[PDB]
Design an enzyme around this catalytic site. Structure first.
Site, PDB file in Angstrom:
ATOM      1  N   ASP A  80       0.757  -1.243   0.000  1.00 39.91           N
ATOM      2  CA  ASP A  80       0.000   0.000   0.000  1.00 39.91           C
ATOM      3  C   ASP A  80       0.796   1.308   0.000  1.00 39.91           C
ATOM      4  O   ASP A  80       0.302   2.332   0.463  1.00 39.91           O
ATOM      5  CB  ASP A  80      -0.991  -0.002   1.171  1.00 39.91           C
ATOM      6  CG  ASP A  80      -0.308  -0.093   2.518  1.00 39.91           C
ATOM      7  OD1 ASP A  80       0.936  -0.197   2.556  1.00 39.91           O
ATOM      8  OD2 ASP A  80      -1.019  -0.063   3.544  1.00 39.91           O
ATOM      9  N   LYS A  81       2.021   1.274  -0.519  1.00 35.02           N
ATOM     10  CA  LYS A  81       2.840   2.479  -0.614  1.00 35.02           C
ATOM     11  C   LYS A  81       3.124   2.722  -2.093  1.00 35.02           C
ATOM     12  O   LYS A  81       2.992   1.819  -2.917  1.00 35.02           O
ATOM     13  CB  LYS A  81       4.162   2.323   0.137  1.00 35.02           C
ATOM     14  CG  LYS A  81       4.148   2.810   1.580  1.00 35.02           C
ATOM     15  CD  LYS A  81       3.400   1.866   2.505  1.00 35.02           C
ATOM     16  CE  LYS A  81       4.141   0.551   2.670  1.00 35.02           C
ATOM     17  NZ  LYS A  81       3.425  -0.356   3.600  1.00 35.02           N
TER      18      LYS A  81
END
Length: 162
Positions: A80-81
């Site tokens: 999720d980055k």
């Protein structure tokens, strides 16, 4: 490419970054790296399921691209980055104006069916060469700035501090 987001692979991002660092080393048009974290993604992904989670990641990746400049590269990492490469950041105040445009786009709701989703975002920023010469140092430093930001609040950004 990244099936979930349609973004370039980690390898391609890597290649893009190496080339930008070789092309831009002037203080007036430096390479700038933004490391973005979707702070509340896990809770969302857990609650809503991976189907919605993947959709969210893809919609986030596209909104990020609309907020950067043509020629810049965006790639997903750590689930999720996102690592954002500003290929010559002249007139962006070392990427600060780009980080603000991203936050403006990502502050808008993500509507899935009748479910409104609002993500919280934290951005770390690293400017070459002050914040690192090599791509590894730049990324690690933007990453550190990111987590620092995340620790102090949400929907924010901050530059790496030597």
């Amino acid at each position: 490419m990244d099936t979930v987001t349609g973004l370039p692979n980690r390898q391609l991002f890597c290649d893009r970054l190496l080339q930008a660092l070789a092309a831009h080393e002037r203080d007036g048009n430096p390479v700038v790296l933004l490391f973005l974290d979707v702070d509340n993604f896990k809770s969302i992904n857990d609650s809503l399921g991976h189907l919605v989670g993947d959709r969210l990641l893809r919609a986030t990746a596209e909104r990020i691209r609309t907020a950067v400049r043509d020629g810049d590269t965006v790639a997903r990492i750590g689930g999720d980055k996102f690592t954002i490469l500003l290929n010559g950041a002249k007139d962006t105040l070392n990427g600060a104006l780009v980080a603000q445009k991203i936050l403006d786009g990502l502050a808008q709701p993500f509507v899935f069916g009748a479910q409104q989703i609002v993500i919280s975002v934290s951005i770390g920023i690293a400017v070459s060469p002050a914040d690192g010469e090599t791509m590894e140092q730049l990324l690690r430093n933007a990453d550190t700035a990111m987590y620092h930001a995340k620790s102090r609040g949400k929907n924010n950004y901050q530059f790496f501090s030597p």
